[PDB]
Write a protein that binds this ligand. Structure first.
Ligand SMILES: Cc1cc2nc3c(=O)[nH]c(=O)nc-3n(C[C@H](O)[C@H](O)[C@H](O)COP(=O)(O)OP(=O)(O)OC[C@H]3O[C@@H](n4cnc5c(N)ncnc54)[C@H](O)[C@@H]3O)c2cc1C
Ligand SMILES: Cc1cc2nc3c(=O)[nH]c(=O)nc-3n(C[C@H](O)[C@H](O)[C@H](O)COP(=O)(O)OP(=O)(O)OC[C@H]3O[C@@H](n4cnc5c(N)ncnc54)[C@H](O)[C@@H]3O)c2cc1C
Ligand SMILES: Cc1cc2nc3c(=O)[nH]c(=O)nc-3n(C[C@H](O)[C@H](O)[C@H](O)COP(=O)(O)OP(=O)(O)OC[C@H]3O[C@@H](n4cnc5c(N)ncnc54)[C@H](O)[C@@H]3O)c2cc1C
Ligand SMILES: Cc1ncc(C[n+]2csc(CCOP(=O)(O)OP(=O)(O)O)c2C)c(N)n1
Ligand SMILES: Cc1ncc(C[n+]2csc(CCOP(=O)(O)OP(=O)(O)O)c2C)c(N)n1
Ligand SMILES: Cc1ncc(C[n+]2csc(CCOP(=O)(O)OP(=O)(O)O)c2C)c(N)n1
Ligand SMILES: [Mg+2]
Ligand SMILES: [Mg+2]
Ligand SMILES: [Mg+2]
Ligand code: NA
Lengths: 585, 585, 585
């Protein structure tokens, strides 16, 4: 006849298929806790050591599986600790439900302990942001929050006065709308528009296809289009892996978390097919300043003509549209543009291999990543933190459609490595999971190494210890007039941190130490988490956006300082290859 | 080589096809004013007398045409005046761009005259809410605002420091993305879900199709499904007119702005097909408490199973889906449920006609609306304010697919009658336009009667003068223990108000005065606006949500009282017709 | 034993001595209405025709009396209409309580009719902003709101779900804290800082005392310091009247709502004593660029050295401090700087008088204000709207300590004339009350002329009809490259508007009509409101901030042009008087 409103709320989460959720209890959320406790056989609470890790893990859950992530924080500081993960979810447009503790309705607005108007706190981050005020409508409010978070691909926040979940409500009235759930309709490509797009692309002298994660389901079409038409591919950083990295006409990504051949080719291209792509650097970096024709495919009307004026714009699903192009074209002969890019890619990859293939001496990030490649399973999942590691992982990870990689793409919050790996292992216990993080980012969420131990999540944590915020040091080098500040700091030994949370760990500082340590780590992570603290040099990785290689554009002195610093003696500018095949720069 | 950023902004508006925009100038927006001044041939600025009328008319533009409405307000009080129209646009989910004046960047944050942080003012109402800080990117921010307003069907707000629009920017850099705008090509409704939905609808003993404005393209299919299957039709109030009111099995709308047959039939129905409908009274009124199967068609995933637990929810276009149902069904013979509803509708319409057809005596709202009907062109547009007029217009207006009617559907702001009619006439100069407003609502925006005169917009204004907030008085009668308060007030003579703004006007107070006054008004409104001030009684209109007609549900005393007050002696309850054709309750 | 929570709320208002409050009822606020209905003897509800007039009148209540103003609005559009008055209260830092209707707790967050999260709506405007969620604590939340509004001199907003005020709560639990309210006993101004400030003031060759409304208790000390020390006085515009306008060394105000002698003398001054003053044009106009020493007296630490680098800033009460200065100084003989300023003032006043004293011909604002002066009682209160009238009233009104004048000082919302006068008459039934408004501002709130009639408030409304937003037209003349836009519009006959609301009225357009019309108005306003619609020319009033009179600073051509346009042939620049008495620039 009756049910506790808190029990009904948990039943709503179960109906929506929520397997696990994260947070830290408090008096102000103890009635939700009480309901979770009764339901521990059907829904799985993950106690984190800091609420931001719970929010970040919830966001990563949604990034990985498409299923709404769920986190909670107690009133006041519990909830405000969620912010970095909630902004990550908003900016990476993934569905997250956040429940926030609040004092009972009898105490609200009395200015009692830890009691405040919590609604304005979440107004900016949240697509849906409500304080619940009734027990009987509470399941509906949660159901509504979940449905909107999914539909609008963002954060829903519900502040819950702690009395409400302990109130009895009629057992027969509440329901979940999970049974009615559907994902948004996929628009179809106009046949004439697609034909026009195809003809412009085929007429191009220097075409590129430039895709983002919007083309996630279209890797086959992308690679076959590239092979068939002899058109090089490039991607946003997060879109790495949609087409295998080994594909010889994959240029990489542009800007800074970037590869040399993509930056060079983009500057030369006459026509860009921009697909499922919201590259945030487009305007600020003048990426398309010399592009003659700009062709766009995107499912979101708010994106069409966003990053550049379009010549042809198609409001349709990337894969349906790319298949439609492929179906109306046939094999094209090689072109000078195609060969020039192929040779530039070979040259670039030989550079990266030369860094990876060092066998002894001071450890650099490059060999560490080679060591990851060597122990990586074909379907490994990578949770990557924020900093030099994005750049290094982007260049050195050998990914295929079978892999997943996540980071905080747009909000770019440091600390995401650890929670993303926690979320990865919960959702994919049979898959190998890496947390790749710099020392700065790993420091911010280090306490939740204990969470991997507690729940026996066999993550391979790899910390890149340069005793710097290297990403920022390099920016200060580029822009600041005065000395470096705040970018070089004291050592943390993460093997000792790991020991402290009762996780097996190693610390290495020489290239020659890698094969054996990484083999041990691989074996350990069959059953338990492991940490490798890699003490690396302060070498700056090659800035793809600040190339000094082309004698027509840089002084001989800058060229040689560049080659020496970046061990890039064998790199050729794209212009070398353009000239070989009879094209001018 | 160079162009003023302000001039570029106006070119962005023109590229998106903005015909007219509303506001009041101020020093903080005089640079936008300056650009508008040079572009009078291609964009038409409408100076309103209160900025709320500008915001409300911009919302109405979007309601009528589907094209973005555009308004502006000077810094501080100019912008804050917009609020009621901007919330109207948010709640009625139509695209509106609001430009807000701001002091120049050299004086911002100086606590100077009328200078404040304006961004937090618009955070809640707006889908997109930004302060421009650069002239060169200003055209792009305006373009982004428009593109987001359309994509998210809501309000975009841009605060513009007044220095920026007078700064020169490169002539060749800015662009509009209007050229990329398109509507999606949707797939066909899934065959198997539609088939399943159809079987359940057809298996019902007491089916209803209950549509909202999501089915605005489906009038033809709705009426044919109804006729073919013998299923009565009911709608949300705003969906009145999608199927002609004369259709014998149109029941009307439910709740309070409602018609008796819809409320009665809905209580009896075993299956409801809920199509393109977001009826906000569903849960609070327990509308579907007796429904066995609830079937849904909606284009928005956020709506799926929102209003009631749903047996089958089809994510699809309403018209495509209704056409798909119609293609798989054929004639069913008349049923008792069909005949009972037809007889119930006949009885209700005779009641309404008895009120309209009074020829002499104290004027009531009923005869006023009959007089509107008599002078109405088949494609007239009606701007309806908020109060008893929603209920009366819903019952009395004889609408067809050729009509439009708009009001403030969900935010329900009083005062929308005047601005809605201004916008209707600006968009449709050759169509007859009515403003039907209560005295309370008309007085809120009365100054903008002068805008109709200034711009020669031949609106027919009909003000219903009861010297009451009638809608609220009746509520107070129902709920309040103590005397009426704030709901009976002093007369305003709107014929004299109209005379004050130099608009021709009449004041009437007897039924027999209607024919000639309305004939004169019809004629005047061939060239100039006109106002009829109708002094009506304070009779409470029959409450469709508080029927006292059925012997089984009400005492004889209560029924005789209800029949007396509401001149309802010849009204029969639905149960009478159910019994007549052999059904129980 | 029990009391309705709503009844308790009204008792809280009564305990704090709230005499009258404003709003428009709605279903979402009908339970507060119900409590008000039972308490008509002790609290006076004023039903306005637009909720903005309620908010603005509540702000005016606080401006006039120092006691909290109280208004309300129904859920959604009722509350949002309050905004312009609530921002006025925030910016003019006066206590206002705004009650907002909300749907009952059982329907909140259900997306029902006119139901939204209202809390974020009021976050920016409000010092205190809460949604009540419990009936038993509701009286306390109202008490907290009032107490905070007073303490923080701003707006408190409470959203009240309509069910709560009809719930019974224990009769003995609730209380008001009005009994605890007091004003602080301040220490005396520190002796040594005041002595130091005095020496610097007295050492100056060209001193000015520049006061704002923080010195409203110090009129006597200000005038005596001026007379004794031979130091001219200037004020902020709102501080007009603290020292009688007839005082021969009152220079007026600076900037645009300004008088020539104040602008001229300020440019010349070597020491300024800035007292109880937060002049917002200080920095943007570079008002003190030539000042050698800047001395400050203010009660608010947040103001200390805010507007200019300050040599000595005394944190103290203005009156106590000015009395302390006066106690340590004695007579100084007339100085050249004193005589030059006196002569400059005489010359300016003769100019203003030449405009006022025209006896026949086309009516200008100048003669209208002379006609107001002639019928004004010595303790008249003036509600002034926003536009040219601020400038004209500032120059022409002959005010003394016995007068009050209010406007929207800083938010400067048009429309405040009507509500300010309603509030003035409600607080001071035995004092003569004027509303001086431009046609633009009067038309924004014109419907509430009916409120003056309904409540028998004998306001003298004077509408200045130029068929322009004159203030803005003159700005466009100064800044805009293209034609005037949005600043010249169609006539509204306000005598006919007034007739429409059943208020006696006159329309005048010639100077010779003034005496008899104003005599009739004075008489009518012994018992009933009256309106005079003054059709004035579109002559630009002399710009005190753009003087062209001094041969050393302007060309002969520019001076002759300025003298012609502004009828300023007999005006002399300050430099003439400086030279006359032996000073340079
Ligand atoms: C430290 C750091 C530095 C970074 N710097 C770089 C950098 O230098 N270079 C770089 O490339 N990235 C960089 N980023 C990542 C970057 O900020 C952006 O997140 C990324 O470039 C955007 O990638 P995207 O367009 O693939 O993803 P999103 O921004 O998520 O956009 C996806 C797009 O696809 C559309 N879409 C979705 N589904 C479909 C469909 N079915 N069909 C068609 N369209 C669809 C969406 O509407 C959207 O427009 C960096 C990240 C970090 C952490
Ligand atoms: C004073 C006043 C009183 C009122 N009281 C009543 C009342 O008593 N009774 C009443 O009926 N109304 C009343 N309303 C109006 C009411 O508040 C709601 O706005 C109305 O009932 C909702 O109508 P809707 O569902 O048609 O519109 P919306 O709420 O706009 O819903 C449209 C729905 O259609 C969907 N949709 C849009 N396009 C498509 C498509 N192509 N295919 C499929 N689905 C689509 C949307 O996703 C959405 O779910 C009143 C209004 C006022 C001013
Ligand atoms: C259309 C329009 C144009 C305007 N333009 C002008 C103009 O050109 N010229 C002009 O002068 N005004 C103008 N204003 C008014 C202007 O915006 C400012 O509001 C005004 O100049 C500020 O006056 P104030 O410093 O007296 O008041 P406030 O800003 O209220 O400042 C009061 C100050 O006194 C202090 N204070 C309060 N009590 C005490 C005390 N007991 N002892 C000591 N200090 C105390 C406070 O801390 C504060 O610093 C205009 C207004 C309008 C409507
Ligand atoms: C929470 C947070 N603080 C600051 C930043 C800015 N930021 C980006 S990268 C970076 C440095 C990362 O340092 P580290 O993790 O040690 O990586 P490294 O570049 O040294 O490999 C900083 C401080 C950020 N993105 N997130
Ligand atoms: C701005 C605003 N204030 C209050 C309300 C609440 N409200 C709804 S209807 C209504 C009465 C309208 O009175 P009137 O226009 O005279 O219509 P009537 O019912 O008398 O015909 C009110 C006050 C509202 N919707 N909008
Ligand atoms: C609500 C609002 N809108 C716009 C402004 C900007 N503004 C200041 S004065 C003014 C003109 C006022 O015109 P009017 O009332 O006719 O006075 P006039 O100068 O003609 O005498 C305007 C539009 C404002 N302060 N408030
Ligand atoms: Mg580091
Ligand atoms: Mg009325
Ligand atoms: Mg004017
Ligand atoms: Na108004």
């Amino acid at each position: 006849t009756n049910i506790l409103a808190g029990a009904a709320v948990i039943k709503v989460l179960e109906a929506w298929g929520v397997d696990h959720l994260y947070g830290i209890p408090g008096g102000s959320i103890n009635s939700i806790m009480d309901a979770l406790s009764a339901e521990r056989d059907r829904i799985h609470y993950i106690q984190v050591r800091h609420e931001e890790v719970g929010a970040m893990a919830a966001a990563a859950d949604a990034k990985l599986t498409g299923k709404i992530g769920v986190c909670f924080g107690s009133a006041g500081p519990g909830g405000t600790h969620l912010m970095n993960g909630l902004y990550d979810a908003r900016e990476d447009h993934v569905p997250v439900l956040a429940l926030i503790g609040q004092f009972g309705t009898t105490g609200m607005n009395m200015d009692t302990f830890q009691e405040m108007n919590e609604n304005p706190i979440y107004a900016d981050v949240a697509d849906y942001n409500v304080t619940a005020v009734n027990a009987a409508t509470l399941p509906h409010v949660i159901d509504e929050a979940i449905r909107r978070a999914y539909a609008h691909q963002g954060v829903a926040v519900v502040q819950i006065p702690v009395d409400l979940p302990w109130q009895q409500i009629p057992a027969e009235d509440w329901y979940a709308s999970a049974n009615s759930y559907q994902t948004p309709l996929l628009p179809e490509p106009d046949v004439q528009a697609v034909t026009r797009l195809t003809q412009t692309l085929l007429a191009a002298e220097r075409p590129l296809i430039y895709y983002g994660i919007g083309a996630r389901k279209a890797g086959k079409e992308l690679e076959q289009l590239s092979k068939t038409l002899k058109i090089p591919l490039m991607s946003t950083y997060p879109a790495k892996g949609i087409v295998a990295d080994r594909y010889p006409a994959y240029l990489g990504s542009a800007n800074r978390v970037a590869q040399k051949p993509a930056n060079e080719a983009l500057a030369q291209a006459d026509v860009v097919l921009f697909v499922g792509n919201n590259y945030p650097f487009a305007e600020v970096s003048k990426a398309f300043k010399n592009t003659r024709y700009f062709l766009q495919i995107d499912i979101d009307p708010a994106k069409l003509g966003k990053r550049h004026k379009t010549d042809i714009a198609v409001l349709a699903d990337a894969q349906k549209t790319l298949a439609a192009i492929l179906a109306q074209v046939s094999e094209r002969e090689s072109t000078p543009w195609w060969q020039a890019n192929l040779a530039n890619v070979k040259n670039w990859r030989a550079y990266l291999a030369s860094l990876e293939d060092k066998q002894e001496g001071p450890l650099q990030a490059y060999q560490v990543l080679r060591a990851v490649n060597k122990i990586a399973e074909p379907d490994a999942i990578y949770s990557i933190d924020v900093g030099d590691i994005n750049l290094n992982a982007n260049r050195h990870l050998k990914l295929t459609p079978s892999n997943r990689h996540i980071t905080s793409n747009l909000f770019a919050t440091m600390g995401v490595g650890i929670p993303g790996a926690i979320a990865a292992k919960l959702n994919y216990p049979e898959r190998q999971v890496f947390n790749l993080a710099g020392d700065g980012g790993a420091s911010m969420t280090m306490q939740d190494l204990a969470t991997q131990v507690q729940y026996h999540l066999p993550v391979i944590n790899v910390v890149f210890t340069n005793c710097q915020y290297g990403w920022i040091k390099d920016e200060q080098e580029d822009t600041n007039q005065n000395d470096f500040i705040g970018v070089e700091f004291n050592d943390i030994d993460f093997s000792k941190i790991a020991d402290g949370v009762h996780m097996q760990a190693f610390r290495v500082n020489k290239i020659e130490q890698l094969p054996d340590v990484f083999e041990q780590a691989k074996a350990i992570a069959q059953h338990e988490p492991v940490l490798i603290d890699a003490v690396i040099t302060g070498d700056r990785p090659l800035p793809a956006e600040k190339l000094r290689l082309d004698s027509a554009m840089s002084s001989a002195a800058d060229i040689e300082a560049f080659k020496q610093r970046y061990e890039a003696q064998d790199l050729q500018p794209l212009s070398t290859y353009l000239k070989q095949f009879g094209l001018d720069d």
